[PDB]
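Training component of the fellowship. As part of building independent skills, the fellow (R.M.) carried out the full modelling exercise for a liganded target. The chosen ligand was 6-hydroxy-flavin-adenine dinucleotide. The inputs are recorded below so that the supervisory panel can assess the work.
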Amino acid sequence: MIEADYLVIGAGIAGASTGYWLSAHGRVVVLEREAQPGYHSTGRSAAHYTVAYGTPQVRALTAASRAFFDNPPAGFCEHPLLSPRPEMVVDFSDDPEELRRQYESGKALVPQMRLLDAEQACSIVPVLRRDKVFGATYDPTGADIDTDALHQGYLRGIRRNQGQVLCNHEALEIRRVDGAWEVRCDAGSYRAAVLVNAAGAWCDAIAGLAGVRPLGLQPKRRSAFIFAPPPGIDCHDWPMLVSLDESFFLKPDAGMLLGSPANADPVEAHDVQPEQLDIATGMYLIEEATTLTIRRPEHTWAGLRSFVADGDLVAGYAANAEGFFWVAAQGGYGIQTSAAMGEASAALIRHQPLPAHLREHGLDEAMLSPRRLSP
Ligand SMILES: Cc1cc2c(nc3c(=O)[nH]c(=O)nc-3n2C[C@H](O)[C@H](O)[C@H](O)COP(=O)(O)OP(=O)(O)OC[C@H]2O[C@@H](n3cnc4c(N)ncnc43)[C@H](O)[C@@H]2O)c(O)c1C
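Fellow's submitted model of the complex:
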């Protein structure tokens, strides 16, 4: 039996970020089922940072995370965590009222947000079909996230604070014993006053092992693919491109193009694979909107974006389950919110007020709590 102050289940971006901030204050042990910590959703994202995306709570967590991403502590990483990647949201269906509403709502959080006419949008991504473009919003502050550097920065930070990150340690049994949580894996047993459930799409399965009422988390499949651009086209500086109704997105990635139908098909928690129909739909939508020809993609994959009913993230203690803390419902936003979520969850776990910079972004304990979910 190994004792810790905080026992975290899951070493994806959620468990890693929470563990990183916790590790300055006590012994953190993170238990990860897979042989590597980023095998599931944290290794499958589009790795983008967009403030004007998700619910108001999501947008506040994303905005509050920028300070850490742009100014991490010395030794956290060797190169910047963010690289510039503006986001351009294009109206392909002639809906100026919706385009206006998205512009006005986005500019309220991003003062530099711009409204583009169709000619400006086509100047920025010249493969757009001009006759299908009716305008666009443009966020000059968008960024791509170096998810490997960020994730490993969190994980290394735990280990440098005498914490442990244990892979090939699937939590198989969970029990409340003598005022602490005990977790049995095949390879060992672990004990801590606080159990941090950061198991991604599996968070409700973990609650199942513990006898704790679940949140109603719904994993949703999103597929993506990479394909070659035409040889005479330099797309490496293009913004992230999204349609106004999030029917698809397209962005440069490693000399290639990354496309997606931006789907959200409800599924059970599992090692999710792309569906041929997902890929064909993404290819059709991109070819409908642009002059690009997509041969069979060179690489396809899918990951899980997991939501509770209201679309907001969850960080708080369970009702009537002492020491059981949820870090869940990261949705499509777990990377870009990870710094605020990790710092906020660590404060809440320790029963401390949220730091001032987080409260200045409108964050509070109430908007993160799982107990807000009414059945
Ligand atoms: C699929 C997908 C997701 C995107 C995408 N885009 C973005 C994006 O642009 N920006 C962003 O912030 N998030 C984006 N997301 C979302 C981001 O991927 C998720 O929000 C984020 O990765 C969720 O992080 P979590 O830590 O909550 O989930 P993980 O699956 O990474 O980690 C959970 C861990 O728990 C572990 N676990 C489960 N059961 C366990 C057990 N019994 N014992 C031990 N470990 C367990 C799992 O093995 C796993 O490693 C995207 O284009 C796609 C296609």
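The panel noted the following from the submitted structure. The first helix runs from residue 13 to 22. The pocket of 6-hydroxy-flavin-adenine dinucleotide is lined by residues 9-15, 31-34, 37, 39-42, 44-48, 170-171, 198-200, 202, 206, 222, 224, 260, 303, 305, 330-336 (CB under 6 Å).
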